[PDB]
Design an enzyme around this catalytic site. Structure first.
Site, PDB file in Angstrom:
ATOM      1  N   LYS A 101       0.920  -1.136   0.000  1.00 44.38           N
ATOM      2  CA  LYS A 101       0.000   0.000   0.000  1.00 44.38           C
ATOM      3  C   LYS A 101       1.007   1.243   0.000  1.00 44.38           C
ATOM      4  O   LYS A 101       1.622   1.492   1.048  1.00 44.38           O
ATOM      5  CB  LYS A 101      -0.799   0.052   1.280  1.00 44.38           C
ATOM      6  CG  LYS A 101      -1.900   1.103   1.299  1.00 44.38           C
ATOM      7  CD  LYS A 101      -2.422   1.216   2.748  1.00 44.38           C
ATOM      8  CE  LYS A 101      -3.650   2.041   2.708  1.00 44.38           C
ATOM      9  NZ  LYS A 101      -4.156   2.553   3.991  1.00 44.38           N
TER      10      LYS A 101
HETATM   11 NA    NA Z   1      -4.084   4.772   4.151  1.00 46.26          NA
END
Ligand code: NA
Ligand code: NA
Lengths: 304, 304
Positions: B166
């Site tokens: 991420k």
């Molecule tokens: Na985030």
């Protein structure tokens, strides 16, 4: 007039070499620190590696250590948590389990998540409301949270249980002096930290307590006692003798210092952190023992 | 072909007005997000207010949510902890309960406790060794820990389960492009975050998934679909329409954005955080709902 003063070292968390808690060693560490002359103990603080253990482990340790201290010296139980309600609940339980005091960082998380002053003030009011023993506010770089001397003093004046302070941000001596000035009678415990690296300046500033590493409170306590007796030159000499050891803790060996010393002295079975905290580098540890041996601290001759 | 791609929004944690977990609302939030067309769901992340809950609450929510999702879409369970062994154990438990993936920040604590890169690599290697589902590395400001694109790619290539990312540090698009160039086939999931604020740029850089807020995945997913279809102009138009909402979430209303919109829509009972996280300021919340009503998102017309 304070209920508490003098040296309050941080009890390290002892693990087995494979990382499980080693409660037998934990009890020995506690007994050694008491024998070393500690005025009190602080548990489950960041020097205790608390970031490496789970909530269940914290509770086991809090019961284990309080029961083992057996009322011998007062214990400060670290109860920091972002949630006011969680912190309040931890602080009440710690009270019920026999804590003399709790210590809490201001609520924050990681490097990014912080809380406005107004809500920090509420957090401490609500924890104070839940309990009947004092709170120590920890003012340390790890929270990334600014707590000015006026704000700290306003908390002590206005929030019943807020009464002690571990000031460990840079320029602690200056800040202690101001806290004391602004807070008056409500500042029961203007204390320092940082393993006693700035102890002599902080005493000149009015510090009445010190929260040190757990490896050699016997070496540091006499500095506080000399200061308390009005013997500032004698305090200087004692500080000068032990400063290289305090400095090596503070700058080189860090959290693991107390554990390396205790493991060398046979106090505890393993000096390892939990992975991923790195092991001491070999020269760093060798240097640390070499300095300690010049000073003959109890931890290297503890005949138990 | 990656095992997972598309929109993986973060499920918020729902509390009662007085701070208790509200599991009934939690399930409804989950069902709404699935009905909004989420490709998968991420739980107990920092947009889920995970820092305000206890370990026991974390386990309860992990069990409850996985059970309620009922295999309908894959779930990423956030298992971050400073301790390797603790993160490993959480990650194994999540796999036992049906998680498709775990996500972990690198080990750190607060603003000051970090771990050298060699130890971070070992942290992920041992977690991977423990489990048989993939790991997502969370690269975000909150850890205060630098994970270079070369270092991420090296873990991807060298550690079996490390396969998703991420990327939420500044300049995500440039970093994604380099991550993909260096890691090749080992980068299964070069994804972004930050509530999709930089989504269109990150798609140009090769992102294949987006971890967004949970309030309006139905508004953002068509941006990724248009991109997948090769219709970059249609992607722009869709991004333009929804950008003020994504921007207000990113800059003004933050974590509580998804909860305010769900409460307004009658999806959950209470939009409150736990104290001391502050409540949304009134003009901030009124502005959010005004922008949302210009866009007719499902959350405001979810008839269940
Ligand atoms: Na985030
Ligand atoms: Na300290």
């Amino acid at each position: 007039t304070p209920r508490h003063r003098g040296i309050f070292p941080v009890v390290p968390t002892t693990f087995a070499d494979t990382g499980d808690l080693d409660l037998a060693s934990q009890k020995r560490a506690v007994d050694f620190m008491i024998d070393a002359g500690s005025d009190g103990l602080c548990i489950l603080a960041n020097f205790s590696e608390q970031f490496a253990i789970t909530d269940d482990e914290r509770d086991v340790l809090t019961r284990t250590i309080l029961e083992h201290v057996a009322g011998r010296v007062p214990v400060i139980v670290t109860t920091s948590h972002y949630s006011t309600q969680v912190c309040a609940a931890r602080s009440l339980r710690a009270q019920q389990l026999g804590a003399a005091m709790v210590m809490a960082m201001p609520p924050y998380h990681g490097a990014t998540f912080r809380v406005p002053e107004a809500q920090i003030f509420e957090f401490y009011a609500r924890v104070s409301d839940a309990i009947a023993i004092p709170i120590m506010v920890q003012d340390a770089p790890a929270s990334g949270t600014a707590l000015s001397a006026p704000f700290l003093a306003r908390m002590a004046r206005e929030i019943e249980q807020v009464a002690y302070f571990k000031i460990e941000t840079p320029g602690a001596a200056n800040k202690l002096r101001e806290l004391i000035r602004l807070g008056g009678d409500a500042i029961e415990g203007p204390w320092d930290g940082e393993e006693a690296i700035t102890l002599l300046a902080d005493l000149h500033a009015g510090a009445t307590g010190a929260m040190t590493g757990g490896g050699f409170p016997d070496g540091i306590r006499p500095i506080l006692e000399a200061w308390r007796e009005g013997r500032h030159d004698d305090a200087y000499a004692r500080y000068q003798a032990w400063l290289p050891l305090i400095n090596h803790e503070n700058r080189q060996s860090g959290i693991l210092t107390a554990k390396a010393l205790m493991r060398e002295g046979g106090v505890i079975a393993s000096e390892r952190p939990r992975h991923p905290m790195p092991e001491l580098h070999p020269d760093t540890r060798a240097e640390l023992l070499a300095i300690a041996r010049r000073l003959d601290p109890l931890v290297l001759r503890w005949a138990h």
